[PDB]
Structure formats: structure tokens, C-alpha cells
Design a protein around this ligand. Structure first.
Ligand code: HEM
Ligand SMILES: CCc1ccc(OP(=O)(O)O)cc1
Length: 403
């Protein structure tokens, strides 16, 4: 049964990863139509070889878009595909160089005090609950990265819930195992999402502003080569990638660390261990466990022949456990010296644009929650569910209690 691999089952895929690494490290899975690759060396090499393995299918729906969803999105004027992750050179190179300028550790330093204050506010609100029960997703991880990226882009922060609906739909439409009928509500949401991206660009043309959208329009007006459609597509990209995965990371920091109370206790006694803890959470529980490529010519992965046009699914979640790179890879250890060799941000020309902003927010959340709620405790591992998806491993809640 494909060595136990269930492509959309996100609850605990690592036993199957381990059997694949040992038994069939490059496996053709006809259930999804991809070569499934699970070893670190093969995955890093494939990421590096962008001339042979293009990202152009990284935003293609796993399940073909059905007739009604297709009509909805055509009639709704949905013309988006990918701001960056599935573009290829030369367009990718040009657009990434322009987008990169806004995401530097210096441009976050002015944001850290605001993020930290917001974290403390959310923590205090949670601790006021009557039952002394909380949920690290809805009570913290849900809002913090979303407000951060909305503020950076120039969207009104009153639409957090709308953007979560739109992000849920993008994740489900593109990587979910959806029937034609199940695609319909998501198709309507994607139409709305794209129209708002277009509106924000038009608004920046008309009224300027102090935000990323207005800065990108200013770059265009000052001679830089980027179109309105490419700017709107960058919003489409950042208003999804800029919070969906970070919410998951924050959620997983508490899920995994509270599952390992000796290491929770370690960061209580020494907050300086928190950055390395976040590194090991990214290795052990990355927000994305698999990412796609397309072979541009007949080639090989791990000595297995792959035909031009074949799709490839790189399971970074498996790479990050590979014993050839990570000794005792199935164990969570915040002192792991080479945890930052993980592939949860990818590798190469498409390497995550916002990885430092994600880690910053995870650090701040862990710093303030450990300070204000040292007695935080999980209700139960068996109380955490994961939505089905090919690529994104999202815990739906993280129920917690405290003294
Ligand atoms: C825990 C948080 C995050 C994880 C695990 C993550 C993961 C990834 C992965 C796997 C890729 C594809 C890498 C590749 O193809 O080589 C990627 C690309 C990208 N990410 Fe992140 N990401 C995170 C947070 C963010 C944030 C916070 C932002 C924005 C502030 C962001 C923006 C992007 C963009 C724009 C790309 C496309 C870059 C390109 O194609 O050149 N991501 N990310
Ligand atoms: C986090 C991975 C990711 C997902 C979607 C993205 O959007 P886009 O393909 O650049 O529009 C960009 C990156």
C-alpha cells in the first residue's frame, strides 16, 4: 500500500516517510501522479537543479479544477496563478529581486516592539478565560502573523477573518483532495481574494500610501520593470504565504515543545535557547512537508529515470528526518547542532523570502508565553487534528490549560 504513505493524511506521516526512505526513496504514486522523493540528498539536489526541475507546477491544483469551479473563476476574472513560487526565470528572477527589498532583518526591527506588544495582549486575553482553558491557534497564532503581514502590505487589519477564509480556500483548492462540488465554495473565495488584490494595487495608484503595495507601485512609476498584474500577484502570494505557514509554525512550537516537557522546562530556565528551539521545530514539524517540481527533460533522481513532463513531490518533511543527515532523526532535540540544515524553507532560487520574519514571530511568541504562562500544559496530543492536504500540515487547534 505504497509503504503506508497516504498523500493527504497529515496527522503523522513520519513512519511512512521512514519506510519510503528505506524501501522506495523515489516512488511513483499514481494516486496523485507524482514521483515521491524522500531522501535528503535527492531532495536538496533536486531543489538546487532548477534548470532541470522547474517550479512551474508548484501552484497547479493537485486535483483537476472541475467544470463549475472553472466557470466561477473565469467569470469572476480570476487570472492569478503565482506571485513567485511557481514562476521560472527570467520572470522569476526579475520579480524576486524587486520583492526581496522589503524583507530584510533591518526592516523588521521597527516591527518587533509592535509584534511583542500584540503577543502580550493576546496572552493576557487568554488567561482571562473562565475555564482556564485556551487554544494556542485561535487565541494567539491565528492573529499575530496575519496582522503583521496585513499591516506590512497595507490591508485593513479588520479583515483578519476574511483573509483566513481566503487562505483556507487557496490551501484546499490547490493542495486538497477536493471533489468538483467541494471546489465550488473555494472557487468563489479565490475570485474575491484576487479582486481585493487588484483593488489594493489600484488604490495605491490613486492615493499612494506607506506600505509594500504603495512601495511597489512607486517602484513601477520610477522605472522599475514590474506590471500591475505582477504586483497584484505578489499580494496574492504574500497575503497567503505571509501568515498561513507562520500561524502553523507558532502553533507547532507549542504543540511540540509541550509534548517534550523537559525541553519546555529548558527554555523556561534559559530563554536564549528559543531561537535554536524554533530551528528544531522547523526541522521536526515544518509547516510544509512536501513541495512540487516538474521535470523539463528526461533525467534521474536517485538513479531512477524520470521522463520529461513528470511531476515530482519533494517530501522535505522526510528529508528533515533522514538519518544520513540527522543522527537520531526521529527525535526532537532543541540542542541539535545542525538543525538549520533542514529543508522546510526549501533551497535554491525559490528559497523562502520571509523565513526571518516567520522565525522572529515564533521567537517572540515563545518568549512572551513562557514568561507569562510557565505552567502552560497540553490537554492531550489526541486533541490535535490536522486538515488533509498534500503539502501543508496545519494543526487545527492546540488546546492548553495552565495553573
Ligand atoms: C514557518 C513559516 C514558513 C515556511 C515553512 C515557508 C516555506 C516556504 C517554502 C517551502 C517555499 C518554497 C521554497 C522553494 O521552492 O525552494 C517558500 C517560498 C516562499 N515564501 Fe516562505 N515559508 C514560511 C513563511 C513565509 C513568510 C512569513 C513569507 C512572507 C513574509 C513567505 C513568503 C514566501 C515567498 C514569497 C516565497 C516564494 C519565493 C520564490 O519563489 O522566489 N514565507 N516558503
Ligand atoms: C509558503 C510556500 C508558498 C505558497 C504560496 C506562495 O504564493 P505564490 O505561488 O508566490 O503566489 C508562495 C510560497
Amino acid at each position: 500500500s505504497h509503504h503506508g504513505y497516504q498523500p493527504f493524511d497529515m496527522h503523522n506521516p513520519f513512519p511512512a516517510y521512514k519506510e519510503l526512505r528505506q524501501e522506495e526513496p523515489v516512488m511513483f504514486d499514481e494516486r496523485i501522479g507524482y514521483w515521491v522523493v524522500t531522501k535528503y540528498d535527492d531532495i536538496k539536489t533536486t531543489f538546487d537543479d532548477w534548470e532541470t526541475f522547474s517550479s512551474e507546477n508548484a501552484q497547479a491544483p493537485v486535483r483537476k479544477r472541475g467544470p463549475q469551479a472553472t466557470q466561477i473563476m473565469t467569470d469572476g476574472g480570476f487570472t492569478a496563478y503565482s506571485g513567485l513560487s511557481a514562476r521560472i526565470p527570467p520572470e522569476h528572477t526579475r520579480i524576486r529581486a524587486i520583492a526581496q527589498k522589503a524583507f530584510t532583518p533591518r526592516r523588521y526591527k521597527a516591527l518587533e516592539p509592535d509584534i511583542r506588544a500584540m503577543v502580550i495582549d493576546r496572552v493576557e486575553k487568554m488567561l482571562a478565560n473562565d475555564q482556564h482553558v485556551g487554544d494556542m491557534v485561535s487565541d494567539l497564532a491565528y492573529d499575530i502573523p496575519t496582522i503583521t503581514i496585513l499591516t506590512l502590505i497595507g490591508a485593513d487589519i479588520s479583515m483578519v477573518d476574511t483573509y483566513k477564509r481566503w487562505s483556507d480556500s487557496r490551501a484546499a483548492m490547490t493542495w486538497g483532495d477536493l471533489s468538483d462540488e467541494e471546489q465550488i465554495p473555494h472557487a468563489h473565495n479565490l475570485v474575491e481574494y484576487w479582486q481585493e488584490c487588484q483593488r489594493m494595487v489600484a488604490d495605491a495608484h490613486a492615493h499612494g500610501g506607506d506600505n509594500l503595495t504603495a512601495d511597489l507601485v512607486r517602484a513601477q512609476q520610477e522605472g522599475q520593470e514590474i506590471t500591475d498584474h505582477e504586483i497584484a500577484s505578489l499580494l496574492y502570494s504574500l497575503l497567503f504565504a505571509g501568515h498561513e505557514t507562520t500561524t502553523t509554525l507558532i502553533s507547532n512550537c507549542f504543540r511540540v515543545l509541550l509534548d517534550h516537557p523537559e525541553q519546555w522546562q529548558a527554555i523556561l530556565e534559559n530563554p536564549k535557547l528559543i531561537p535554536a528551539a524554533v530551528d528544531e521545530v522547523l526541522r521536526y514539524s515544518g509547516s510544509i512537508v512536501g513541495w512540487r517540481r516538474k521535470a523539463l527533460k528526461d533525467t534521474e533522481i536517485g538513479g531512477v529515470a524520470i521522463k520529461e513532463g513528470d511531476g515530482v513531490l519533494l517530501l522535505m518533511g522526510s528529508a528533515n528526518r533522514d538519518e544520513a543527515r540527522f543522527e537520531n532523526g526521529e527525535e526532537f532535540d532543541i540542542s541539535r547542532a545542525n538543525a538549520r540544515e533542514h529543508l522546510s524553507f526549501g533551497f535554491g532560487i525559490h528559497y523562502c523570502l520571509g523565513n526571518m520574519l516567520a522565525k522572529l514571530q515564533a521567537k517572540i511568541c515563545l518568549e512572551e508565553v513562557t514568561r507569562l504562562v510557565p505552567s502552560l500544559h497540553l490537554v492531550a496530543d489526541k486533541a490535535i487534528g490536522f486538515r488533509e492536504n498534500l503539502s501543508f500540515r496545519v494543526p487545527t487547534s492546540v488546546p492548553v490549560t495552565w495553573n
